């Protein structure tokens, strides 16, 4: 009945998590030191719940697949595994090393016909069986009802999920971090619940953010493609395109030889991390507005920094998330204006609820919003009236703050109608074979 | 003998719900974490209530239905289910599927006579059965006595309620938000128990309102048809020509080849969700005023607010709802003149009753508000007599406020005189022919 | 023996109800959210009294009724029932519906001659059964010895008591709100206790009164027969002259072709509403003075006050009522000069007895009353004796304030001398006969 996750029986991330999942029983139970523990346990919980919620007996497609996760389920599998990253041997390598080890004190799964599956395809590498194949997403042959992505940043959203909609797949889940971040086109963020940062790659030799390095010495800049990810100590490489692709609106079409009608909502939200329930039906209903809407429980907020970067003195946009209760407590000081370091001292007075070397910067972003917000009371127009007299002026803004209880909005694209090598080595392969047997 | 509702057994909205039904006992029991619980529990409460009324062995016309919310029920229901938005094919595909899942476990129910009617319209698709059609509710030929409209914005009431009376229907019910927001013509507006916002189409990009998005930058206006909802992270455009024709007087006449006498009234009223109660006779009787008239429990507020919108400086009405106690706690300050800074920080001392994000334009009506009424003790006129020297000076008035325990009163119209394809795939017809064997 | 009432076991108004029935025992049994429970409570005390007052064995008029309140009843009645307004239809429907659903349950009612009474009716409508008929007050043929008017404004009252009398009634009653506040022709008022407002129908743009409606902009009047009736959020329309026939001298007489003389008292008042209980003997005796007095419980205020009505600034009367613990609590303080801000901020301190939305009215009536004495006490004359040098000068009067234990006096006429279609259709008259059967 209950569920046990790898943290510290103290953490305060605990309470969050039992908001999060009120059906479960929550336990810790540490048994590492590991650094990325919180996003585990999120991960952790999402997939108790997904197979919680659909019937059994349903085939599941797992996309980008780690298949040493899906050994010890009841469920049905079928892995999608290509080897195109550099981490991919040695989980294949783990996977047969783990099925080796347990084969005859497990009886009540499928051991013995996973090890033949890992044999045939050991032996010939353009087949497809129950529970392996060496494809990738738009080349594998076998028919499901469900599909699955988890922490996969790689693919083009709607191909991905037309070619998984033309197999007779009616449902689909997705697992990752929040893309809100990056419709607003930011140059550098934070997770601070998860221990993350990351910057745009031109920015990694500033001072000040939370992931640089810089030197000592004596003495147009717009974002770009390629972006670096750092979940505790472990470093992805990730482009804008394929982040923001995922951003999907309420209702879209797929419109090819087949078409389908496609509904996107989110489930669960937990301070950046989230998941999404995607159905798809064959035909064409109703008609797209093209809006994308996220609810926020805690406060988002995007500001602009000045900093060095290699020594040169710069400005760039920076983004993170902020504890609800500390925003309600600072609803009476911004009333007035206030400098940036009373406001230091006073949330540091209410403050650890939040980390500490975010407070700089956030009290800095405060401190203009109010100000922005006098003028405005002291400016007043007419109502119903544009003076446009033929150039109108544009006012400067340095702070977007969207308070807990609000919704952000967003015009995306919602109509589509535009959409093999092994691989592997005769020395892997070998590998393999010598440790199943 | 109790009612179970969703939501988290410390929220303070269970007191509320308490004092609008006081005929039930309410029970928290919560298994999902649903951003629009709230909403939910209200029209749960409001179905029991409305079954709970009327006598049995009556059929009950179901329009604009999502058939799998009256399988459990014991009564008759005839559900119109045309497929006119996006959202109706996975309606259609869950109904038959929780039609397959439970099909010898329940037996008090019509189950079978269910499941026949489903395949009897897949495959002929204009014929009427006892418990499904469709057509809209302008071409459904069943005869049934009573009515009930679920958060349907989408009709004309006066013609389908027209339609709905020459079929030998006497009572009708309709569930939604309150309307009076739409007849003041307001921009944007809020309804803060229910986490709900609503905007017009033309200031989605303003910066301080509840949805909205910006950006960071350096440096005629009336409201239009097409408003956009947001209840949690759920997003619903609309119209406000359909939206206001629901706001109906006290009397009414249709007169057509034959001819009825209508009376509505309000039942249920809790913080913006209504439920209205229509009664039709046959003949003309008496004669009509053309008043509606709304009571207010809470405080309602609209006001003049000044934003920049896509960095362009406007000024345009908002409107929104506050708890009675607050209300009554500010008569003694607002005898004198205020400014917003101090009745910011008074209401901040006074407060969470009510969300913060809404205090700081609340506080902007409130000062304004007073102000304006000690002009008019200033300058005090003679009884009975009015000065136009031939033109006269109007008032610049930039707040309504309607205090607990008052009434609105407008003039609408009261005499009405004026009043297919299947649309189905073969496709869907196939995948739910197979879903239920 | 104790009489349940439908209003919360909390409310502060339950004390005042057992003040004015001190010959009962009232218990709160609350079933409904209804808005307008108080006024409803209050008619059904009354109607028990005026029961257990009369003898049995008498037949009982029930002019403008709706017979679904007499069914349950063991007293004779019978009911008058024209159609003349747009709710008469929906209450004989009911009444059909509630006859239907008891035909055996009940046995100690003349059920079954209710019904043939009502199917004879249906069949042919000119004519008169024991217990209903089709025609008014000054048509129909019963002959009894007791009349009940029960919230009935629409007729005018020496003739409806004259074609009473010549019938053989002797006694009657009348329940209804207090019509003193329309003796003194104010524009409008309130009834706090029931939570009523009403206001002239030239003044319901205006901007702070209980019943208005008005809108944003940046920028002789006297009153009129029509008159409009807000209880609850129930809206009525009626007539000046038709209100006003009802206050009645204390003796009159009625000189016909026969002759009556008649008296009227109050026998019980609470708040606003009353009951009056009047007399008719045949023959002339005795001779009348002309005069109507009211006796106040509570505060009556009469005041002019200043707004704008669709922009433009002017200025009318209003009346309300105070309790009288406020009202002595407030002797010490009126013996100077005292500006509104003040008194607005003692009125809260004293405050909740009293609705605040009346509050910021009453503070500015009390100041000017104080002031108004201050300089009759410096201005003295001399005793029995008028200076009128030929014109005399006339003061300026701006409030009338009728404080506990006093009593107001108006002159009014005590001398009168001056004094048919079915209207159904056939579809109703079917629809009676069908639910009937
Ligand atoms: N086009 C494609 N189709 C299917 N898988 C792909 C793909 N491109 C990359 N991948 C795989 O997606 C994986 C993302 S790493 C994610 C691994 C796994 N989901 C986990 O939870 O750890 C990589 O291993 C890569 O091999
Ligand atoms: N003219 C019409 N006649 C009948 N139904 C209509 C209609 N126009 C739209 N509808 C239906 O009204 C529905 C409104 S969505 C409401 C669904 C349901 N009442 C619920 O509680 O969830 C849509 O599904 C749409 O199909
Ligand atoms: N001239 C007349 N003679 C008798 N009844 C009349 C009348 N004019 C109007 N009425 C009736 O008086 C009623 C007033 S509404 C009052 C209904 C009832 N007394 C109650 O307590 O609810 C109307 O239904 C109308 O039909
Ligand atoms: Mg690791
Ligand atoms: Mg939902
Ligand atoms: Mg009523
Ligand atoms: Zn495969
Ligand atoms: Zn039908
Ligand atoms: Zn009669």
Redesign the interface.
Known sequence: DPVYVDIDADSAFLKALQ?????FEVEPRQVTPNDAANARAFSHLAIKLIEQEIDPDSTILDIGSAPARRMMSDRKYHCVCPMRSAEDPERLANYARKLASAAGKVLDRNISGKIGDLQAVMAVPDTETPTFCLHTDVSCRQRADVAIYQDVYAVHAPTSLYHQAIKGV?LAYWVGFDTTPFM??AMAGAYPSYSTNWADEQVLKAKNIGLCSTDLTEGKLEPCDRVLFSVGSTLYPESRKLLKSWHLP??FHLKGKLSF?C?C????SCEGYVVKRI?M???L?????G?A???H?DGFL?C?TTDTVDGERVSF?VCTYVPATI??QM??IL??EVTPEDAQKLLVGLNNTMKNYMIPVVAQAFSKWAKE?RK??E????????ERTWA?????????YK????????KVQAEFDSFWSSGLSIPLRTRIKWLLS
């Open positions: 908001r999060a999942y009120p059906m009616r607003y086109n309420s209702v009608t509904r909502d989110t489930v669960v159905t039906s064959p035909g209903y109703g008609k797209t507005t809006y809407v996220t609810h429980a995007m602009k946009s925003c309600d609803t009476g009333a007035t917000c405005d009371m400016d007043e127009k007419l109502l119903g009236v544009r109108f002026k544009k006012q400067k803004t340095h702070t977007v308070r807990p209880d609000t919704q952000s909005i967003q």
